[PDB]
Each structure stands twice: as structure tokens, then as C-alpha cells.
Amino acid sequence: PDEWEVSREKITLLRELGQGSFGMVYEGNARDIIKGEAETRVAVKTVNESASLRERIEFLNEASVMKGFTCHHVVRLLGVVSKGQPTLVVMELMAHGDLKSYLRSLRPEAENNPGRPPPTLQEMIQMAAEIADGMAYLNAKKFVHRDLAARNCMVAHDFTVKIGDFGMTLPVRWMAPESLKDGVFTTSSDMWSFGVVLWEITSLAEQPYQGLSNEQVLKFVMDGGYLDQPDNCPERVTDLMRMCWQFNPKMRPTFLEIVNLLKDDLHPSFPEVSFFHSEENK
Numbered sequence: 001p002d003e004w005e006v007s008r009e010k011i012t013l014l015r016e017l018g019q020g021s022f023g024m025v026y027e028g029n030a031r032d033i034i035k036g037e038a039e040t041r042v043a044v045k046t047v048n049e050s051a052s053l054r055e056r057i058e059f060l061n062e063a064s065v066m067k068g069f070t071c072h073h074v075v076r077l078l079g080v081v082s083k084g085q086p087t088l089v090v091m092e093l094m095a096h097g098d099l100k101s102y103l104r105s106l107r108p109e110a111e112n113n114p115g116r117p118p119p120t121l122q123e124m125i126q127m128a129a130e131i132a133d134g135m136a137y138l139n140a141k142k143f144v145h146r147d148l149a150a151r152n153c154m155v156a157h158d159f160t161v162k163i164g165d166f167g168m169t170l171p172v173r174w175m176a177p178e179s180l181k182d183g184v185f186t187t188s189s190d191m192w193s194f195g196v197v198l199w200e201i202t203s204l205a206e207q208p209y210q211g212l213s214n215e216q217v218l219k220f221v222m223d224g225g226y227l228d229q230p231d232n233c234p235e236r237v238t239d240l241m242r243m244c245w246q247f248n249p250k251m252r253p254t255f256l257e258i259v260n261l262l263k264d265d266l267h268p269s270f271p272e273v274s275f276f277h278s279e280e281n282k
């Protein structure tokens with residue numbers, strides 16, 4: 001931990017990035033936080049003033065959990081400021097924000113279209129694999145996410161997609177039938193959500209089950225229903241989605257199996273940074 005402690009003086013806040021459950025998250029710069037570089041672009045989490053003592057404590061404890069993660073496909077903790085107020089949690093910056101928002105900016109009618117076409121089949125597979133790789137890492141770490149969705153995935157400067165955090169410490173449209181029914185959460189229910197993320201990716205982040213109320217989705221899914229394939233969705237992605245949505249959780253694949261299914265169609269750098277190809281998984 002002390003090894004993680006960073007002096008407040010080294011952090012410079014630049015602008016608001018978004019609201020976290022504990023408080024505002026800002027984009028900033030950190031002086032000499034990573035060996036080899038003078039200054040690193042970073043995301044800085046803070047805890048709102050209206051927070052109770054216990055929440056300020058839980059805020060730090062969460063950072064402490066992340067200290068144990070070293071996966072290229074999960075957003076990394078860079079350091080923390082726990083001495084004095086306000087406390088800060090420095091994470092690697094994901095320059096393109098949450099996946100959902102990123103996907104909607106690539107929509108033809110997007111008032112903020114970055115100027116490129118929607119994601120290619122190749123890019124979608126790369127995203128799937130990266131997301132699956134991060135999930136496999138978390139699962140190997142004994143963590144069941146419970147809230148996997150595009151909003152909870154992030155996009156780096158080089159477009160690498162990573163899982164935001166270790167999970168939710170509600171998401172009806174993303175929950176597996178057994179979770180909706182018995183309220184049970186497993187890595188298998190995380191696979192179901194994973195499928196909805198793929199659906200989100202192919203639909204450029206449309207609202208799942210648009211038209212149905214959370215009341216109807218609840219019954220629909222529990223009766224065995226699932227999402228319709230987006231228009232002109234690539235067959236290969238449709239098959240992955242279908243596997244993820246088998247009513248019987250024992251029938252769905254594992255994240256490791258997802259990665260294995262797509263390993264021969266990824267960017268060359270993948271094996272050098274993936275958990276799947278790392279020695280922590282062999």
C-alpha cells in the first residue's frame with residue numbers, strides 16, 4: 001500500500017469526466033507516477049463531501065482490492081492519496097470513456113461522430129476478446145462482476161477495451177434468468193451479460209428490449225425469451241450471443257472458452273498482453 005501512496009502535489013486535475021458512485025471522476029495529469037515517464041494522463045476518483053465516514057472508508061478499501069490486479073484488460077490502479085483530505089484514487093486514463101457512450105458516438109446521426117465508420121467485424125471480435133479476457137482474469141481472481149454492460153467497460157486511447165472494475169459492490173435488462181428468478185449470481189450469469197454487451201456492440205448501444213418495461217423484460221427473460229439479433233448483425237457474433245443466452249447456465253461457455261474461440265483472429269499484440277496467454281493461466 002505505502003508503495004501505492006502518491007503525494008497530492010503530483011496530481012493535477014484538468015476537467016470533469018463523469019460521476020462515480022462515490023463522487024466525481026476527473027481527468028488529470030500525474031507527475032512521475034510511472035517509471036519511465038515524466039507525466040501520465042490519469043483519471044482521478046474522488047469522494048463527494050456528502051459522503052459518510054463509512055463510505056470514505058469503503059472508497060479506499062475498493063482501491064485496495066484493485067492493488068491486486070495486473071491485467072491489461074482491466075482498468076488499472078496507478079496510485080492513491082489517503083493522507084489528508086480529500087482522498088484520491090488514480091486510475092489509468094481511458095481516453096474514449098465508457099464503451100456505451102463510445103458506441104453511440106459512432107452512430108450515423110451522432111452529433112459527435114468522430115468521423116469513422118461503425119466498428120468492423122474485426123474490431124468487434126477484438127473487443128469481444130478483450131472484454132472476455134478481462135472477465136476471465138476477474139473470475140480467476142474469484143470475482144463475479146454482477147454488472148457487466150457496455151457502460152461498465154472502457155475504451156483506451158488506442159481503442160483497447162477494458163473492464164472498468166471488479167464488479168458492483170438493478171441491471172434487469174442485463175441479468176440472466178436465474179439471477180432474475182433466484183437472485184443467484186455466478187460467472188455464468190456474467191456470461192449472459194457478456195452476450196448483451198455483444199448485442200450492445202452490434203446495435204451501437206441501443207437500449208436492450210426497447211419498448212418493454214422492466215416489468216415485462218423480467219417476465220420475458222424468465223420465460224426463456226432473449227434479444228433479437230440487430231439488423232445485419234455478423235453471423236459470428238450472433239452465435240456467440242446465442243451461446244451466452246442458453247437458459248441453463250451450465251450450458252453457457254466460460255470467458256476462457258470465449259477467448260479460445262477467437263484467438264486466431266486477433267491483433268498480433270494480444271498474446272503479449274492477455275491473461276489468456278499469460279503464465280498466470282497455464
Ligand SMILES: Nc1ncnc2c1ncn2[C@@H]1O[C@H](COP(=O)(O)OP(=O)(O)CP(=O)(O)O)[C@@H](O)[C@H]1O
Pocket residue numbers: 017018019020021022025043075091092093094095097098147151152154164165167168
Ligand atoms: N479510468 C477512467 N478513465 C476515463 N474515464 C473514467 C475512468 N473511470 C471513470 N471514468 C468516467 O467516470 C464514469 C463513472 O465511473 P465508474 O463507472 O468507474 O464508476 P463506478 O464504479 O462508481 C460506477 P457503478 O457504481 O455504477 O458501477 C465513467 O462512465 C467514465 O465516464
Ligand SMILES: [Mg+2]
Pocket residue numbers: 152164165167168
Ligand atoms: Mg463500476
